[PDB]
Structures are given as C-alpha cells and as structure tokens.
Symmetry: D3
Subunit: 236 residues, 6 copies
C-alpha cells in the first residue's frame, strides 16, 4: 500500500559513481541504474536526471595541469554528455523510454528545451540533461538545482557514494559522521559538504528540498521515493 511520496523528481547522478573501480564506465552499474529507474517510471514517477562527468574530466583539475580553464570546463561538459549517452542506451535496452538533451546544442542527441522537457516528462519519458548549465565555472550540482527548479521537481535526489552528508570525507577522515536531517541554515553554520554555495543557495532560495543518498546501495533510490529511512534530508 506504500505509494510513492514524490510525483516528479530530479535525480542528480555523480559522474564518479559510474566508475566502480579502475576511471571510465561500469556497464553493470549502468544496467542496475536502468532497472531502478525503470521501477520509478512504472510507479508513475516523472524522472529527470542530471548526470556529471567527474569520472572522465574536471575543468579545474585540467586547469592546474596548465590548460585553459574554460576549455577544461568544456571537456568536463562533453564528459557529462558521454555519460548521458551511455545512461540513455542502458535505459533503452531495459525498454525504458528516454531522451538525451544537451545544454550545448549537439547533433548525438537533442538540444535541451524547457517546454519539450516538460512534455516528455508528462509523457512518462525519462529525461537526461547533459552538459550541465552549458557554462564554464559551474558544476553539475548547480545544473541539478537549476533544472530541478525549471521542470518544477518536488525534490532533488543527489546520488552519491556515501550514505548521506558527513562532517568530513568518510573515506579519509576517521572522525566523519553523517546527519540525517539539516536545514539550509545548519548546512552553512556547520559548513558541511553537500554541493557548492552557487548550487545550494539557489536551491535554498527556491525552497527546493534535497535528499542525499548512496546509489551504490541497491534499492536505496526506491526507499527514498517510497518515503523510507534513507540518506539525509535538507529542507528549510
């Protein structure tokens, strides 16, 4: 009798979380991703997914090596388009209707269009938003919040490799602990790592709730949507 507690969601997929040991993409994690997204679609949930590129390139990182920061961000963005393309295909092969859209118009997929996106969602099609915001100096987390506000999602689900928001990187600091609930205020006064002010403040400004969970946990995405104890919730 459960029933989902969300009608339209914006699922931000970390690029790094498509690696799963060794750079590149992990086909089996991609296929699991599809199956889990398939379930949401059937449950009637409208899904829009913003995907990152950290498993291939990060602009700032390339900038340290000497490259022009803008060109570095452009490669980072093309990296998100490569993930989006792999994700879409995994979706099609799992018999799920999906469309890839790119912030920077390319031709291989559609160009992002607001009205078109809303139409696709109302029609139960999964919409994959690539190239983030289309601009350099930004991160895909920003795009998740922007697109999330544009398509009017009920919430942004940040898929990560950790169970929630920790006080410090749980993989490097042995003192790291995660909270299960936070307000946009607490996040700043405690200075916990969630996103980057740019993205965050935008979400706060527009009162868009955020739920941080672990995508490496099979079933976690479904628990979040069904309203079961998973991850951390950031509200006002």
């Amino acid at each position: 009798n459960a029933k989902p507690v969300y009608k339209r969601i914006l699922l931000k997929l970390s690029g790094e979380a498509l690696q799963g040991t060794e750079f590149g993409i992990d086909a089996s994690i991609l296929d699991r991703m599809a199956q889990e997204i398939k379930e949401l679609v059937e449950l009637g949930i409208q899904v829009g997914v913003v995907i990152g590129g950290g498993n291939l390139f990060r602009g700032a990182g390339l900038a340290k090596a000497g490259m022009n920061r803008v060109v570095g961000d452009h490669m980072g963005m093309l990296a998100t388009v490569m993930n989006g393309l792999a994700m879409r295909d995994a979706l099609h092969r799992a018999y799920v209707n999906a469309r890839l859209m790119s912030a920077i118009p390319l031709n291989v997929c559609d160009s992002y269009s607001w009205a078109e996106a809303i139409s696709l969602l109302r029609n139960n099609r999964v919409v994959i938003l690539s190239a983030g915001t289309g601009n350099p100096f930004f991160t895909t987390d920003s795009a998740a919040c922007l697109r999330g506000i544009e398509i009017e999602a009920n919430v942004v689900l940040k898929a990560t490799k950790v169970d929630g928001v920790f006080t410090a990187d749980p993989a490097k600091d042995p003192t790291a602990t995660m909270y299960e609930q936070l307000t946009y205020s607490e996040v700043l006064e405690k200075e916990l790592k969630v996103m980057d002010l740019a993205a965050f403040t935008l979400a706060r400004d527009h009162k868009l709730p955020i739920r941080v969970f672990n995508m490496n946990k099979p079933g976690a995405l479904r628990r979040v949507v069904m309203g079961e104890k998973e991850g951390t919730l950031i509200t006002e």
Copy 2:
C-alpha cells in the same frame, strides 16, 4: 634543405596523448606535441590533424559489454573531440593558430567544412579534424585517409609508438626488422599490420602515400618532413 611536403595529414592515435597510467590525457606530452607541430607551421608546412579516441573509448569494446554498437561508436567519436579540444588548447597556448572542426555538428567547436578547411590550411592554420568520418563502423584511420584525400595532402603521416613497420611486433619478437619502404601490394601480401583494412584500401585506390613513424622519438616528425631517413614509407 627545405621540407619535402607542402601539406600533410597527421594522424595521431588516441593513445598518443596517454600518460604512463594508460588512459586520458597527459598535459606534458600534449605540450610537447604542440612544439613539434609549431615547428612545421613555421617551416611553411600546412597541417591537418586527425586524432583518435582509444585513450578513452572504443565502440566494439563497449558493444562487447552489452551496449548498442552504434551508441558505442558515437561515444568513441565524441572522445576524439575531447582529444581534439585538448590538442587545440595546447596549440593555442604555444601560440599556434589552430581550429577544431568536427564531423559531428557540435555548435565548443565548429563543423567540418571542406572549403573552409582548405582556406584555413592556405592561411597557415592547423586544422584539427575530430569525430572521424561521422559514422559508426569506421575508425579514425579511415577518417585520416578520407580527409587526407579531400584536402589533397601530399601524404598521411601515421604516428605510432614504434620506429616504423616491422616484420612482426619488435617488442614481442626480437627477430623483427623494419621496412624502409613498401607498396600497398606488399603490405597486403605479407599480411603486414599498418592500419584498418577499409582505410588502407581507400588510400591505395587514390594513391595517397603513407608514412609510418615514431611520434615519441624526438625530431622524428621533423626528420620525416625533411626527407631524411625516418620510419616506413608506403606508396604505389
């Protein structure tokens, strides 16, 4: 003792930008490539470059993992655009006029246009050609021979990590010897591995000469262009 080629078509394998890790791009090797191409431009030579994507993706390889071959080939092509973009930036940072063109419209960079290409070339601007031929079921080798014939290059220079064409792999067999010259017919007869059959065949029909050389041996590119003994030549 001036150069022997007015216009060439440099074909770099995606692995050419790989560091010691065996994947991605290595800033220092990129910058080194840019200096070597800078010298050719100053020498009066017109340069067109076709770069691969093996340091990132291969369609056949992805298809084995379950993915749709065509989508795998699109990601491969897209990777060659990531390389072309990094190569262009190294060029601009070394003060060399260069323009990235793509066989797949990506209005990042502009689209490949034969007429525009010939114009950029006549103006001493290095033309970088990404996305191979624009179609799946093809390799960047074929794009090198194709573009090479379109822009009327004097020769296709195939960059490898070996000094030339051997009787067998010299690293997996110390008996192997390097040919100083060959005809398309002998390559096929002796079952020699130079490049993709489709591509090779194309170059043979249009009598486009091929020079296989070592891009890691300092001075090689210049020597190959100065008519000095270096690598293997292939004609007929």
Copy 3:
C-alpha cells in the same frame, strides 16, 4: 496465407530508376513506388529507404569535366536529397507516414539520427535516408549497407533496372546473363557487378544478405518480400 518473410528492410532506390525516359523525375513511377511501399507498410513491414542521385549528378562524372571532386560529390548528395523529397511527398499523397532525413543537416527536412530513425520505424513510419553517408568519395550503395546495418535491417533490397546481377551490362553486352544466387565469395571470384567493394565488403563483413531486383517490374518488390522467386540473392 503467404505472410512476409522480412520484418524490417532497407530499400536502396537507384536514382537513375526515377527517370524513366528523357533525366529528372518520372512522377508516375514515383506514384507507383508509393503505392508499392504502402502495401509493405500495411503488411507490417518496417521500411527504411536509401535513395541515390544518379538521375541528376554523379561526383566523379563532374570531376572529369574539371570540377573539384569533393564539390562534385556534394552536388551528387544534394541530388539524393531532391529525390528523397519527391519520394516523401509521393508517400504523403498516398497517405503513408514518412519522414525525410539527411546525412548532411539541412533545414527542408530532418537531420539523420539513429535513435530517432529506430523509433520512427518501430512506429511504422517510412524513413527516407538522403545524402548517403554524408561524405564524398562514397556511393549511396555504401550508405544502404551502412544504414542497413545501423537500423538492423533483415536484408538490403537493391532496386535496379535489371532483373538481377548479370555477367555484363545486359543493355550493352549481348552475352550478359544473370545468376539467381551468389555468395559474397562467388561475387568476387566471378567479379560480377553488384555494388563497389567498399559497400559490398561491409555488407559481407556483417553478414547482411542482399537481394537485387527490378523496380520497373510492377509487383516485384512485393514478391521479394513475400518470398517468391524474384531477382538474385547474395548471402554467405
């Protein structure tokens, strides 16, 4: 009780076969074409058609007259887009759902897109692929085999003006005879005229059967699809 022996086909239409006495297009042959394609659509067959331009321009021919070979191929390609447009219209007027796609993005029709093409076919829409492969130095026969492999056709039906594959041009050599069956091997050891190695080898490589028939024969296309004795079959 017949029932078609093919579910998805790639129909390669020769440009020359739309002339029918006197250059240009033959409206009545175009309308018959539509009616016959209409029948396949109703039978449930998914049709993708690659159309040539030989009735208007051929690149190599223009090259002999002195023109730049690449520009010549570009005109040849625009010629296929003109035929595709006429074909599409004949289809619409016969109340058949059809979409025109061009290898070289134009705007008047759609730009070729793999995923989009598959969706249109699954939806029983006729897909007309123009501008061949998008590249010069190639022929539309190449494109028929490439697109045929891309959309995963069960077979490529080469529509011609002769009943099959002959030993020599039946219109010029009085010794010309046609075979009714051939393997990709036989085709080469006998050196019979079918396509051009480029195209052919590709088809062979991917084990795509080919059936050569005469489109000037009213009903021939329907016989081929129903599995009746028509034309020549090339298999491995």
Copy 4:
C-alpha cells in the same frame, strides 16, 4: 574610363548554365562565366550573384504533375543551391574568392546573413545567394530584387539570352525592336515582359535600377558595367 557601378547584383537564370542539351550544367559555360566575373572583381566591383534553378526544377511545373506545390518550390530552391555550388567552384578554380550563402540553412555552404554578406562584399569576395527568398510562391527574380535592395547594390543586372528588352520576342517576330531605356511605368503600360510582377513591383518601390542584357554576347557584362551602350536600362 573606370566602372560606373561600385556594387551590383548579378541575377543569372538557371538556364544560363544549360548546355545545348537544354538541362543541367555545362562546365565550359560555367568556366566562361567565372572569367567574366573575375574581371569585374579585379576592376574593383563588388559582386553579389543570385542564380535560378530552371535548368533543373520549377515548383509550378512539378505541381501540375501532381506534387504538393510547396514541396515543388523546395526542390526548385534546392536546385538553385546546386547551381550556386557549381558556380562557386568555377570561381574558386579561376582563383576568385567567393562564398555560397543559402536562404535555406544547409550546414556544403553557410547561411545567408545580411551583415556577413556586406562584409564579404566590402572584402572583394563574390557573394553567391542561393535558395532565392527561402519561401515558396516566389521566383529567384524576386530574390534578386530583394537581396539587391538589402545589400544596397547600385543596380540589378538581369542576364538573359537576348540583347535587351524588345517590343515582342525577336526570335518569334522579326518586327521587334530593342528599347535602350525604360521606366517601370512604361514597362507595365506597354505590357512588356521583364520579370516576375511581384519582383518588378518591389524594385519599383525602392527605385532599384534594372539592366537587362545578354550574358552570351562576349564583353557584354563588362560593357554594361563600363557605362557603354549595352542592353536595356530600367529606372524611375
């Protein structure tokens, strides 16, 4: 005795490229046109060219055959792009800077852009304008007067196979005489055939002078531009 026009708009009828066969393009006449335009460019004159498609297709003609008029007009326009492409190549082969622009985006050639056009013109590059006005129910004559007014040409030179404007067809009536000058009003009053009414009317309202001359009479184009007695002038 320098030229009398700084910038002109040469309007070539599609038939201007037709050989003796009465269809298509004749390489030798094309090359001859290129030499005559080369001379004008050297003389300091800025040249814009609008070419028709009657040596290939006409929308009204196709519509009579059953086809949708709009589609017929698209094919007609597309033919003017085939001519513009061949004319551009003859130009480049005669060493004349020229760029083909299209009223129908064909990202082959680039799109018509008024500002870019004026810039190319000021840079002594022959601008070739294809696809007429971009809309059906119009002729390339109207595009000649329209573009002529946009680029602020000093005059529209209408190339015909006759010496000028006659009282009646001189080939179907030996009584006919050639006017050396006329006003838009007299043309309409005497029911004289100069061009499409829509087009004519447009030129009259913007006071764009028209010179009708013979493109086959050697030296004519130069004479018309050197203020020497040649053809018919039309103003008011």
Copy 5:
C-alpha cells in the same frame, strides 16, 4: 446546431492589439485570447496563428531614426517572436496544445517547417508562426497570406482593433465608414486600407478569402467562425 463554417483558419494577430493601453503586452488580453482560441480548438477547428510585432518595433520606423532598415526589420521580427512566445505560454496555461515556430531558426522554439506544421494542425495543435516571412521589407500581413496559402487555410482572419475595413482611420478621421463586403477589385478601386499590395495581391492571386474583425470584441472571433454577422469579408 450552429456548427463552424471553417475547418482550418489562419488567424493573423496584430502586434499592437496585445498592448491595450500604455506599449508591451497586456496579460489579461493574452489570457482572453487563449480562452477564445481554446474554444475553436474544441470545436474541431485547426488554428494557425501569425502574430505581428508592432507593439514593440517596426523596421521602417526605426529606419527614420537612422538605423539600418534591414537591422530594423530584424528587430521587428524578434518582436513577433516575443509575442509568439507570450501567446504560446498563455495557451499552455489554458491547457491548449500549442507550438511556436520561427521563420528565422532560433533555439527558444521550433524552426518553421511546412510538413511539420501540417502534421501539428491535423493533430489539433495550435501553430504559432513567428518572424513573419523571415525577410526584411515585408510585413506580417504578407506572412499571414503566405502561410495561409501554404497550410491551405480556408480563410485568413485578420484580427484588428476596429470592426472592419474603414474608408479612413476611424480614430482620426470623423468621416470614416466601414464596408461589410468587398471584392479584391473594389478594395483597389476604392483604395481602402486592408493590408499592403504585396500581401493582398498574393491573397487575391490565390483566391484566399479574408475576413477583418475586431479582437478587442470578446466573442467576435467565435461569431466569425460560426458564420454570424461580424467584420468585413473580402472575396473575389
């Protein structure tokens, strides 16, 4: 029992009539517009609407101030795209399927395409045509007649701020009177203000009836469509 007397109409909306006191747009007039268009859609009528830009910019007017006439027309056109976008949104918010198309390809809406437009109309979607004809020196009235003939409307409904065609501007001349019926002949011999010959003659040429009514009159559009006494009818 009424029943509409038209199946497909082309509704030309004056840009000025979206102001309603004070430049800019009048949201409440826009919402009424939507409701009235909603009714037509439900009645089964296929609606195509051409919208002007006179409430923001007029090319000729900008030309007097000193600006380049062509650039002035380009701004006028962008003005029609801004109105089209506002109109579309008002339509979506009233739960009416609508698509915006632009004569000059932009990316934010679709690019105008004939076949696509017809498909959208057959599917009961409202089609908004912006950027008029795409060319300078023309008015949106021209585009209304051109698009009207293209999509094969049964009639063009010119929405204005006056009840019909008057002898003189009813707001400035106290002698102004309107006729209730006119032939294309009468319109010229009486020289009444309806459109501009360009547009008009085109409509006449193609025998497209025109009905001029007042959109500020709530219900007037519905009366016209139902065949009730409203506005002025221009026929041959």
Copy 6:
C-alpha cells in the same frame, strides 16, 4: 598618459538605452554610446559588452502577471538581443567593427563562442554578448561577471545613471555620500547595493575587479579607463 586597462567588460543596463519615455531604445543615446566606445577601440582597448533588457522585459515581473517564470526569462533574454542588435548597428554606423554573439543560438547574429570571442577581441572588434548566461533565474549582471572571467577582462565596468556607489540612494536621500573604493567584504557588510548577489559573489571568488560609474556623465567612460578619479572601484 595611456589607458590602464587592456581588456574590459562593459555592462550596460537595458535602461541605459531608454529615452525620456522610460521604455524602448532612443536612437540619439545609442549613437552617443557608439562614439564613446569608438574612442576606447582607437585607444587600443579591447571591449566586450553585456547589455540588459529592463527597458523591455523582466522575467520576475512577467511571472507576477501569471506567466511561466522560465518563459518570462526567455523573453527577457530575447530583449537583450534586441538591444544588442541596435547597439551593434549604431557601432557599425559609427564605423566600428563589432559582432553580436548570443548565449541562445539565433542563426540575426551568431552564437557565443569563447574561442571566437577571444579572437575577435584580439583583432580589435567590439564583442557584444546577448542573452545573458542563456539560463533563466539569472540576471545580465551575472553574465557580465561570468563573461568577464571567461574572456579574462581586466575589469568589469558597471554603467549606471549615478556617479558611483553611495551610502544610500542620493536621489531619495541628500545625506548619501559616494565611496571612492570598496572591497567585496565591505559591500556585503554595509549592505550596499552594487548588483545581483549571485553575480557579485562570483566576481569575488575570481577576484574580478568592478568599477561602478555614470554612463550619462560625458567623458566618464574615458576617465574611468584613463585611471582618472571617476566612480567607485571594488576589489579584494
């Protein structure tokens, strides 16, 4: 006494082109702006311009009226393109090379391209950047700081109708005084209104200096660029 900035980013508020009426564009102020920018170009300074759209539309303002915020922001952006087009024409009419680029592909003008921008700038061509950042929920101020950082401008010059930054509005309070210099920290601490928080914050992180000055005070722009006491500087 040469200029103190090699490359600047001039940000003009849409209201900067407004006449006394309080809406639209005033030809004379436009021409005056062009003369002031002409002088900078002659002085060797590279100029990038980001113009707003408040003299026409604001998304938030439209959203209050009932419209979809995103669509309101698209119309706003589109208005900045109307201004950019008028500003470009005034520039060309004053004989200043200038190119309009848009963050929203409008193939009127070409699309924004970082690399192309840097090239135009190095060539002494004024680059006009329209459509802000390309995304809704942003202001042109943010686009000024963003583009300013991308093109590596030496400073962002914020044109206002006031002499600089005051303690309070000087027109609504005669006690207000003008700061001659400030740090990002003091602006935020003293609750000073300089620009959009999002934008400001961005400029602070990249240490992009901001100069607020009066665009109506003749000579101001030149003085600001000649290192002479004028307006308010903001750095840290």
